[PDB]
Structure formats: structure tokens, C-alpha cells
Ligand binder design. Structure first.
Ligand SMILES: [Mg+2]
Ligand SMILES: [Mg+2]
Ligand SMILES: [Mg+2]
Lengths: 165, 165
């Protein structure tokens, strides 16, 4: 039974990957393993480029630390200016998939006291759908937003005939 | 009854705006009207920045073309390199909400040609969730993807206290 390495030990992230893979590949089974590896970037990325690079670095570190898995998944949240979002990276041995989730405007008060490297600042939460869930009256949750990005990041693997190398 | 102007006459886009507002506001009541205004940018935006500008322009023009509405919404798709996405902009008479949908990787064969009607090849299977719907085996559709971005764009209007003018 092939396994999938998640560049994170957060149960929430591992579950989302589980849900995304079970949704897209319901006819297959894998062992999802959440590993802990450095991103080699700020614990709190302050740019789109840095957020994506951090996800990419974790995936490379994951491959090096736990070789042999069929898929490696990186999931990194970050912010740019007044927006927040997360980068999704899925890598097989030969191909790579990626997608950035929809971005959201954070409150100015939360933003100002976040540049100070403070997250938990969201107290004026990681159980009611996160910042997204709170800000959207739960019409969206971090899980349902990440789910879409994860599925999008799998496109290359879903349509091999259209995405070579 | 109040009214909401959608900077597009596309029934698909008008529908999404309706569903978004009906979801965030289960009650209330307003009339959605699809209007046709120019974006003033390339018919097919080629950068994230240009795509956002096109959405902002249509909204601004819609405000001058049809004043009086309580909400004005711009929904502009675009691409950059090998990624596609859409910008959502919602404007009232005091503030602006915005969000860019999760992005998706287009097949290299698609980026080659480009004219997002190349997708009409490998024909109207396209109205089966659009490219998104076809590429994700309908596990996602352009509509369900646009729906999340639209809700996120409504954040400022959902949290007036945390989002001033
Ligand atoms: Mg490394
Ligand atoms: Mg809910
Ligand atoms: Mg479906």
C-alpha cells in the first residue's frame, strides 16, 4: 500500500489532504503520514513568493527525509499586504502540482498587530473554521477553502495525457 | 427593493453573484441586474494585476452607468504564465471587498495556442463545470470555485466593525 507524506504534523492539514485524495481517487488507498520538516523561510511568510517557496522547500525536505512515498504534499499559509492565503504543493516522483487558495482580506487591526510577528491574534478560533470560518459566518471554513486548492493542485495527476513531465 | 449591479451580462456570472449573496444573506431582498460595461484592459488579461484592474474598471464604470444600486460586483477571469484565475470585486457606497479565486494550472498545449476558446477543443463539454469541471472530474466546477471567492469578497460587508470605510 503506497503512502503519502504530508509536510506537516498538523492534524487539520493531514485530514484535508486525506479528504482531497479520497474525493479525487476514491478507487485507491494510501497511508497518509504527517512529517515535520523545516520550511527554510519565516515561520510567518510575508509574501506570496515566500509562502510558495516555503511549501516547495518543505516538500523537498520531506522527500529527502522520507523517500519512497508516491506523493508528497506541502501546505503553507501566508500573507501579502492585507491578504492571506495558502499554497498547496503536490509532488510525485516525476511531476508537480500546485494551487494557491482563494485569498481573503484580513481586518486592519489584525494586520497591524501581525506585522509585529505577534495567528492567535484572531481574538477580538482553530475550531470554528479558523479565520475564514469566523470572517464568513462559517459560510466557508479553512477546511473547505483548502479542499478546493488541494483538488486543483491534483489536476496534473488527474490528467496525465495533458500534463507531461 | 434594493438592487445589485453585476458588471457582466453573462447569465453564469449573474447566477454566481445571486447564489453568493443568498448564501451570506439568507433573507433580505434585492434585484440582480447583469450590465455590459468595458474593462478597458485586454479582452484576455495576461497578468494577475491586469485581471484585477479589469474587474475594478468594470465596477467603476457600472457605478457611473447605473448609479443607485446598493452593490456593484466585478467578476473577471484571467491568466498569468500557465495559471488561470478570476478576480472578484464587490463595491458598495462606502467600502470595497475583494478576493481572487484559487488558481489552476492549464495544460501546456493550452498555453501554447491562446483566446480562452482553445479550451473548446480537448465542442461544448465546456458547460460541464467549465475547464475546472472537466479537469477535476467535476469534483469542482467553475461555479463552486467562483462561489468561494465571492463569499470571501463579501467579508468587509459581513464584519463592518472590523472593516471601516
Ligand atoms: Mg531543504
Ligand atoms: Mg458552515
Ligand atoms: Mg460534481
Amino acid at each position: 500500500m503506497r503512502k503519502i507524506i504530508i509536510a506537516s504534523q498538523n492534524p487539520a492539514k493531514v485530514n484535508a489532504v486525506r479528504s482531497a485524495f479520497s474525493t479525487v481517487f476514491p478507487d485507491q488507498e494510501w497511508e497518509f503520514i504527517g512529517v515535520s520538516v523545516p520550511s527554510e523561510v519565516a515561520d510567518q511568510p510575508m509574501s506570496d513568493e515566500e509562502t510558495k517557496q516555503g511549501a516547495l522547500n518543505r516538500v523537498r525536505n520531506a522527500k529527502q527525509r522520507h523517500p519512497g512515498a508516491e506523493y508528497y504534499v506541502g501546505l503553507e499559509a501566508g500573507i501579502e499586504e492585507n491578504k492571506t492565503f495558502a499554497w498547496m504543493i503536490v509532488e510525485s516522483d516525476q511531476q508537480r502540482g500546485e494551487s494557491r487558495s482563494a485569498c481573503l482580506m484580513l481586518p486592519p487591526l489584525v494586520l497591524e498587530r501581525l506585522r509585529q510577528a505577534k495567528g492567535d491574534v484572531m481574538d477580538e478560533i482553530k475550531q470554528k473554521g479558523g479565520a475564514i470560518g469566523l470572517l464568513t459566518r462559517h459560510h466557508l471554513t479553512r477546511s473547505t477553502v483548502y479542499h478546493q486548492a488541494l483538488i486543483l493542485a491534483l489536476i496534473p495527476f488527474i490528467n496525465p495525457e495533458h500534463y507531461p513531465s
